[PDB]
């Protein structure tokens, strides 16, 4: 176990957020028009934040072309991506010149252990009914239990 594995020649710096902003905009853009993410879903809000955490001035010029030339006549999810895109274009202009933020929007999940009538033990970490954000989770943390 003590055999030393460090070497400076093997470090892997990861930098190019300017690419992954211009990727994950248009990666989100076809998850909307092909219905793989609706506006009710919570991972589209997770990855609208991670785009405006990576906002550059040219990323808006990237987004604004794809929302101006999105064809609304092709469907109703094509209505969705122009509306949900332009709402993000208006947000990336504001968070521009501000400091990128960690806002976790994951839906709070708790444990539920149920035993099947055959006798199998299955663990479903289901969504909490009364605690649905970290806004409500911290309110749970103040109450004790």
């Amino acid at each position: 176990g003590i055999q030393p594995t460090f070497s400076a020649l093997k470090s892997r710096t990861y930098d190019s957020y300017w690419n992954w902003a211009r990727q994950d905009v248009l990666s989100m853009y076809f998850d909307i028009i092909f219905g793989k993410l609706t506006s009710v879903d919570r991972e589209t809000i997770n990855q609208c934040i991670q785009i405006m955490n990576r906002a550059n001035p040219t990323l808006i010029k990237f987004m604004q072309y794809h929302i101006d030339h999105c064809p609304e006549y092709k469907g109703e999810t094509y209505k969705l991506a122009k509306r949900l895109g332009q709402q993000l274009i208006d947000n990336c202009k504001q968070v521009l010149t501000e400091d990128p933020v960690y806002k976790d929007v994951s839906r709070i999940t708790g444990p539920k252990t149920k035993v099947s009538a055959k006798g199998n033990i299955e663990y479903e970490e289901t969504q909490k009914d009364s605690v649905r954000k970290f806004e409500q989770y911290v309110y749970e943390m103040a109450q004790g239990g």
Binding site: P4, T5, S7, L9, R12, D90, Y102, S106, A117, E135
Partner: protein, 832 residues
Amino acid sequence: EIEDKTSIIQPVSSTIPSQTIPFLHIQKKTKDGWEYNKKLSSLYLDGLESAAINGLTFKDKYVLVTGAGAGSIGAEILQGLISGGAKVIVTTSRFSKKVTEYYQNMYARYGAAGSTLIVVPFNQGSKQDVDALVQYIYDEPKKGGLGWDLDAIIPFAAIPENGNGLDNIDSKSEFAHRIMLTNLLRLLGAVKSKKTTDTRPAQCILPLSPNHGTFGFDGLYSESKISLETLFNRWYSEDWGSKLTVCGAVIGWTRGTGLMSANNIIAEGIEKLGVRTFSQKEMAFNILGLLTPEIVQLCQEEPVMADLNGGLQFIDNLKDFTSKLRTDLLETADIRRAVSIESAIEQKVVNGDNVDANYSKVMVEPRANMKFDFPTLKSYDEIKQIAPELEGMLDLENVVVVTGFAEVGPWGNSRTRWEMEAYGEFSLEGAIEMAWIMGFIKYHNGNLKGKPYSGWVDAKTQTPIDEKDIKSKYEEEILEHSGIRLIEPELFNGYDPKKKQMIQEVVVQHDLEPFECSKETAEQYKHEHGEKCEIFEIEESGEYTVRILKGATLYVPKALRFDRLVAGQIPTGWDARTYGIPEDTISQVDPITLYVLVATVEALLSAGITDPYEFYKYVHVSEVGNCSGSGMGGVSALRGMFKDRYADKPVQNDILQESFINTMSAWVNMLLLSSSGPIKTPVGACATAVESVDIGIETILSGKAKVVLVGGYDDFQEEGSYEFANMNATSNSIEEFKHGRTPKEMSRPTTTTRNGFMEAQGSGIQVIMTADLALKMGVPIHAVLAMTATATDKIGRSVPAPGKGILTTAREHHGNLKYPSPLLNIEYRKRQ
């Protein structure tokens, strides 16, 4: 919901009931020990309310995070550091391709602007690594380091140890105690000595435990965690009070994967007491809230205990309590099992074993559905919504279209390259096609061990195999022996890249003893060594002895460990037997033309041309061209006339006629087409198969051909690989292994750390064709070649160095945009 700084008006400090300790409380030390302080704990939670409704900033924060494996707490704080803008060193004790592509995906989604993530190999049970990694974080970029200065440290790394009791404290427990404690302190003690500035503290985040020996058999785990609590008092007593500020987190019940999957079944049970457990994204949230700028200032005056244990210290005998909840759910699960097992068989006894076979359903095994699938033709009223009023404008006799195409690549053909390209995974249809081309499965027909059989049978044992057992038995081996991998000596006539054979000219200084040889060879030695050898006839046999004398030149063999050990092979087991090339043409012809014949049929097949003579029903024989060509092709036959002939190895007599670049297009004509159309042959090095299109299109639009093949092909050999090494074009494979790169990832376009390309072999052919003759034959029009070009760059003295002469495909005149040009408008040309 999408429509950012929401103000808070009633904080969580006012939400805490009296007499009630929160689930997450900061402690403060008094003389009696540690106990709950409401002032510090309300300042904690009001930051976490703002960290939830507004969020956290981590810009210009330099963190070290150790123990950050995929699916831990230490990887859910890395999503929360990097999303805030932190600059994190990440440690992996296992360094691989699947390890760092986890971290690349984690940066490609969460990498906020300003953030960097660095994955280093690091052992923490090594003293020599913890000395050398803080020398990599603090030293300057001119000495190889990073030039950072750490503003937080999170040393979470540990060993999974279990079953080590007190009588069995073993060597895995002495190595876990060194990882978790006696070299964690050396990690904090080395960031101290590299700091020179008392204005930059480094907030240590220590994963304390609330369970110090209250469980059972874990080894030195509790002795590793309880002695991290003495860094609270040692902050006062030693000289690092401004260098390292300690902020110990007490992580409660975290519900995660790994070895705690046997403990998730009772997290529901102890939550019924009024206690709470945590998922990993929650103890992500709970430790990242120890990095708020109000806690950060509080850690700089006080050592901070943050007891994030969610009420679990208010449970008497937690070991015996969670033991009975785990027993009772296991003792309920088996009595409900063993009853339903016995009641199942008791119904088999009464109702009979003939009936219960009719209770199970007949499931359907799936097969592969290899189709051919020409591209899906849209309907004509649909085709004019995609393209508006373009009807009747282009003359179809002057539009070139690709009507078929194929390859012989490192990933098989055009179908199984696209599955590895578009998806990274083979289908079921594409895994019996890589098993077909690599020669794993052979289609048996007839009798197999008595019984009649018609299906896929292995080639090594020859036993029947279902089509879903093609992936499950061979996806490990199809992937291991295809694509960019290290050069296998069986594919290149004994070329071992580690033992590249060379000869050294040695002048003999003491004469060899005589060896017997034949008549003409002894006359060949005496002519070509001259005085410096002797020959003498054996009159009993007629063959001569020859003695090499002092001063004659010998050639002594040698070898050298050569650099380039990886290249992109045609898949190991690819064979031209399996396509139907006769063993006549196999034994004559150079290996690259085998790759061109294979590629030419299944490119015609991609055009619906089952027989190459089906063109001549529509076109004349003098109008089927072949404007294909190679870059260097024939390297195996250039090795025959230059390297193999000089040794007088037994070589084919007409090897020079397969060395040519226009002779692979001969075997296409000699064995398939029998045409009289325009043969040409391009040879523009790398970019030769795009000028092959260029020579292809103007061949068609001039009217000299109506069908013409268009292609490119080249082969990998020993002497071709060594000479790209000395031009420093292909990347040194050995220095890729000091960088920890596997062969499937050292072919790196666009990259910051790209080092040269990866050389490969094979072919590629397209059957291009006029647009109207394509729709008069009924072939699949796959593409429309609108443009093609070639261009020569600028005066230079460096041939491998590229240039920009092809930028003049976009040349136009913008001196006067006052008048828009009339001729670009589609309705102007239509009325003209």
